[PDB]
Design an enzyme around this catalytic site. Structure first.
Site, PDB file in Angstrom:
ATOM      1  N   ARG A 246       0.831  -1.195   0.000  1.00 31.36           N
ATOM      2  CA  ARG A 246       0.000   0.000   0.000  1.00 31.36           C
ATOM      3  C   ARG A 246       0.859   1.236   0.000  1.00 31.36           C
ATOM      4  O   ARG A 246       0.687   2.091  -0.851  1.00 31.36           O
ATOM      5  CB  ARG A 246      -0.981   0.033   1.172  1.00 31.36           C
ATOM      6  N   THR A 247       1.843   1.258   0.894  1.00 36.50           N
ATOM      7  CA  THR A 247       2.778   2.371   1.064  1.00 36.50           C
ATOM      8  C   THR A 247       3.756   2.576  -0.076  1.00 36.50           C
ATOM      9  O   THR A 247       4.052   3.713  -0.476  1.00 36.50           O
ATOM     10  CB  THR A 247       3.528   2.232   2.399  1.00 36.50           C
TER      11      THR A 247
END
Ligand SMILES: [Zn+2]
Ligand SMILES: [Zn+2]
Lengths: 310, 153, 310, 153, 310, 310
Positions: A54-55
């Protein structure tokens, strides 16, 4: 040249109220009138020594929206990393001769700080370091709060879940304790309480905070409900189950919430927030996840660009 | 200073004398601050009869003076010590260990997951007194430990 | 069209003294006056069948500095690769229909050579192939030598470490044996000596070389000290330990070195070079690692561009 | 040996004086052999002048006596040290370091795979001199190393 | 009581000429007249910290042929590390309270020796401690040389293969060196030669030895041909192939060998002994493995029984 | 027939004061006068679905010391799942047709209990069912407390370590609670405190207990010091280090302890008991592990024999 120009973004504690506001002001602008070639010709290293999709995807998308190039890697799953070999000091010394900025996520506390001592003139941004910092997630939480509440002072903020080991709630508490008149409500299981140290710092500022056992117990008076993931491993499955029911948000629990109240969660939610909440106007975790892009574009623009022309 | 007993006593020409080091701390200081790594005449006196304070350690380093900053580093180990400057065989100066701001490369972060352990970096802790108890915050992992905990190592 | 235009870069042996100099001249220029859109619109495949982060990151950064796009992959950790399935011949036949150049690193000797027979008109650059070649690392070692010594002829060069299995020292020896008057000093453990074959080739040229057991034994007279990593697996931990002390560079060993003498190491160093050396003006391994970028930009520019306008 | 009758260190009535310790080894000896973990008066002189060797170290431990074995243990470090047994302000007898046959606790096995590295066991090496050097054989891994290597840095 | 009663068998260097003859005399009697209930009621722990199916199966068959019970475990691991903590010391201190003897194999040198320091009155038998010792394999070999040659003195022994690393040839050379008039021919490639410490002991003891280029030069003289496996991993595939042929045995080479000549091998043999050798009367590697059963019963019988009525 | 004949040993809560004394009286007699052929002809299955070398080795040595045969298996897995399908029910229904008793360890709570529902007339003995029970470890502890103190009533017992999770201290507290006049001192960090359900039972039964900050406060009174391992994984590395020191035992702390005071530990001890403790007469953790042999023989002797002529 802007305050943040060429600075390293390691810990939220290194950022003053003025810095936070500068980033947030820039983010809002980048969101309104986009600058797709601002960073054209820069090469940024996406160094995920600890994998996080996600990051990584969000940071990289941010890099791309501003025209920058990206080189990097992820999950260095070395078979039993007793010694992965090269020291981190050496890796950064080498990588800093190729790129213009390094975004890194590492398993050990203090890694981005160390990197700073070997990157020479190359800025290093902390994408997460052990159980210590994760500043970009906070800049994104504050930007989402300011955007939805219109302000970062005088808010009634509730923090629910694993308050003990959640590195993000720790940071959000410190960032917001830089603005005035915020009241905190801490809803956590006895075994996962807010660390004493945070309460201590809060008291020094003369900031108010109360501990609640139930969410609906404070439902009516909160502007922000910041849920975090209670990790079962930190607990026994029986005790987990024994407390579970007490900290999971369902749409029903929101019937008394204010019109302006929003529910944030660094994600991933799984047990804690029922999908029925997704459909209510208070759900804001996915929108919060989208704001990471502007919070991240902003940070990179400020660091890599002498003066922001907006 | 000179433990003038009866027969004889020694003395350095000019330099520093660290007196009133509590027993068993003397050697640690020599080890920790690597004071024995000089071509200078060093004279050490361990387990000396203090009578009042008890037994003490004493260190005399010739033609060598300690900056106020260096003297301050002794605070956690020998806060009672007196550091005397000697020039012309006499005490021109006398200072004492004052609580430092930072403590470099002599301590070890008790956080096992701290990046500091496995790397080419000197440790560094921020000293913060909270009425006699001294909390030491690591520069790297940013954790704050009691001076008791950090000091055991 | 330039000598290297559309050629394949497989082995250092395929490059003449004139080719080496052409690459090095181009690299110096690309370092002075950068050309960020030179390769705009090209798509290069970064094919690391064998994973190597330092090398991949450097090549890719090189691709980005010139405006090119990059598609590719790394560590094909097939569970017990008795047969990964498709033949390499087939993979290259397919990939060469998508891209404009292929940079590949493979576990088996001769892989880049084979690829050449199936890439059609698409140039393939060797990023490392088994224990055979690694030409880009040499172009980078020579560029760093010429930059620091001002010349590639008449040098006193020492090669220390695993001279037996180090594919890079083997290549550097051949490249420099193309220039005149170089004197080689070979410092290696008895079990890891320079292969006879290399000595043989050297003798034919009538080049001088001597074998030393200690580094300080030749310290005073070397311009370049090229250290390599002695891998413990190649040895017994007792015998390793028995010889270790004899081939690790500490700043002290440099007190007699010349002002112009530099220490190079393909990296990663670990045991062999103490950090205290990092602080001396003779340390040049990290700078050497940065020069990979220009050596690599140069090579790609020459191959993919009809004529280099500089 | 060195005789100063002016700024001289105060003599001991009874005990052991290790003299002629070559400079920079004296501190190692205190460390290695845990000579400071005592309550007795210890007086250490470092980088002492002695034309005989330039700078030497010296240690005087009061009311303490080293046995023949214990003295033998200094053989690898200060082979030419003189251990003068003192009593009533007079050298009641000297002693020279003899290379012993076995050496425990102070050494570390060079062998990375030796089990002695991760276990609650005191290192022990067999000593055998062979022209040019002294070989040390590990009790555990049974690998023989040159002292020069066992005594690394 | 017999001399080996309640004694630890750690290294061959710990046993004497007599001890060796005592073990081999007992082995012979047990091979002739088995004692299926000598060790009944005894429980023995087969602790294989390092898995070795061939060695374990043999040791345990030996225990069962004497009537003893066996509890134990094979291997312990992760990938390139393991688990958490518990010293070998505590493990032996615990197990020492259940069983009557400990047979153990371990990856680190000196492991068996350390066990004797924590096992109390329980004898510890070494089945292999890293590159150090492996007592029982040497006893099994010696018993095979004696059984077929009629003596352990005045033999012509040729050792072939990897002499640098083979812990079995180093040990056998040391065992045979305790007897008289033996002569040794060492036949190994230059990279895998008999270490100097062994050569020195031979010299010191006035024992004759000599290096040879090929088995051919000395086949006629040899009484015992001891082969070892040259693992390809100790060499680079190219290197391996060049030497290989020099140390591979075919039935056709046995051509001029003495009637009594036996070919021995610790096994696994792979490429080194051609299958056509198995059909000659000289092949004795399988019969050597079978004798391990009796050299092992011998040790256990002697260490656990105060007196043998054999 | 004896009361435990053909009975399942699942939980400590299932046995009475008498049952406990009966097991410990038998253990004592077997320790005094062994019966090496009591269970001959009996085949017992050592089923370790969850590997536990220490527990298995002990249980199996116990089976062998009584003359029984053992078939079994250790562990079953994949990485974070396993395989396909077959219920524990069918597995026990099958194995129940071959063997005379089943000893089993399993990762899920209640596994041993479920086995008794499918094993027919074959007794099932629990060697550990997840965080629930572990009957034999408590019997071994009790036998050690009785053997050294002379009684199970009127003792001063201090428990140290991780009381929240230690399934051994919960169980021991419940076992000792069946006897009279015992007093308990609980010494644990705040995050690992003795659960309330145990505290409640103590209260309900009028049993005296009290929390203490350090072993020091109560060393003089204590008869039995029971330690447990605080796994670092139950805490954040920072947290661990702060508490650690409070619950680590050194020989120097034993200073004011009673003559009869014994230090016990289920093991593996790692950091908690300093090695210098092993040399005091108080160290009894190794002798406690040895007693497991007799508490285990006792159970098997009692469950499989209708009458014991001991
Ligand atoms: Zn730290
Ligand atoms: Zn060793």
């Amino acid at each position: 040249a802007n305050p943040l120009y060429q600075k390293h973004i390691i810990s939220i504690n290194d950022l003053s109220r003025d810095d936070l506001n500068l980033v947030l002001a820039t983010a809002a602008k980048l969101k309104a009138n986009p600058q797709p070639e601002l960073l054209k010709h820069k090469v940024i290293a996406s160094c995920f020594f600890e994998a996080s999709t996600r990051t990584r995807l969000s940071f990289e998308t941010s890099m791309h929206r501003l025209g920058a190039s990206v080189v990097g890697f992820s999950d260095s799953a070395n078979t039993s990393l007793g010694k992965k070999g090269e020291t981190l000091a050496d890796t950064i010394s080498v990588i800093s001769t190729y790129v213009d900025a390094i975004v890194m996520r590492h398993p050990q506390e203090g890694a981005a700080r160390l990197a700073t001592e070997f990157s020479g003139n190359v800025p290093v941004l902390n994408a997460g370091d052990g159980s210590n910092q994760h500043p970009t997630q906070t800049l994104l939480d504050l930007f989402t709060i300011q955007e939805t509440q219109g302000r970062l002072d005088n808010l009634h903020v509730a923090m629910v879940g694993d308050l003990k080991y959640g590195r993000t709630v720790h940071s959000l508490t410190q960032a917001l304790a830089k603005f005035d008149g915020n009241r905190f409500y801490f809803i956590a299981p006895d075994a996962l309480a807010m660390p004493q140290y945070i309460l201590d710092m809060l008291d020094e500022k003369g900031i108010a905070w109360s501990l609640h056992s139930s969410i609906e117990e404070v439902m009516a008076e909160v502007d922000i409900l910041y849920m975090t993931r209670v990790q079962k491993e930190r607990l026994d499955p029986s005790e987990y189950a024994n407390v579970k029911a007490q900290f999971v948000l369902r749409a029903s629990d929101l019937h008394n919430a204010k019109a302006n109240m929003k529910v944030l969660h660094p994600l991933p939610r799984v047990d804690e927030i029922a999908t029925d909440v997704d459909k209510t106007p208070h759900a804001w975790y996915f929108q919060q996840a989208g704001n990471g892009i502007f919070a991240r574009q902003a940070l990179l623009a400020l660091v890599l660009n002498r003066d922001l022309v907006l | 200073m000179t433990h003038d007993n009866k027969l004889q006593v020694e003395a350095i020409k000019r330099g520093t004398v660290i007196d009133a080091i509590p027993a068993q701390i003397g050697f640690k200081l020599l080890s920790l601050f690597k004071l024995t790594e000089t071509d200078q005449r060093i004279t050490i006196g361990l387990n000396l009869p203090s009578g009042e304070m008890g037994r003490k350690d004493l260190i005399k380093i010739e033609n060598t003076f300690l900056s106020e900053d260096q003297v301050d580093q002794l605070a956690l180990y020998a806060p009672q010590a007196t550091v005397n400057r000697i020039d012309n065989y006499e005490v021109v100066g006398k200072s004492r260990p004052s609580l430092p701001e930072r403590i470099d490369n002599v301590l070890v972060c008790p956080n096992s997951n701290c990046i500091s352990h496995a790397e080419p970096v000197s440790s560094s802790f921020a000293v913060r007194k909270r009425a006699n108890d001294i909390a030491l915050k690591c520069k790297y992992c940013e954790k704050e430990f009691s001076h008791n905990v950090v000091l055991a190592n």
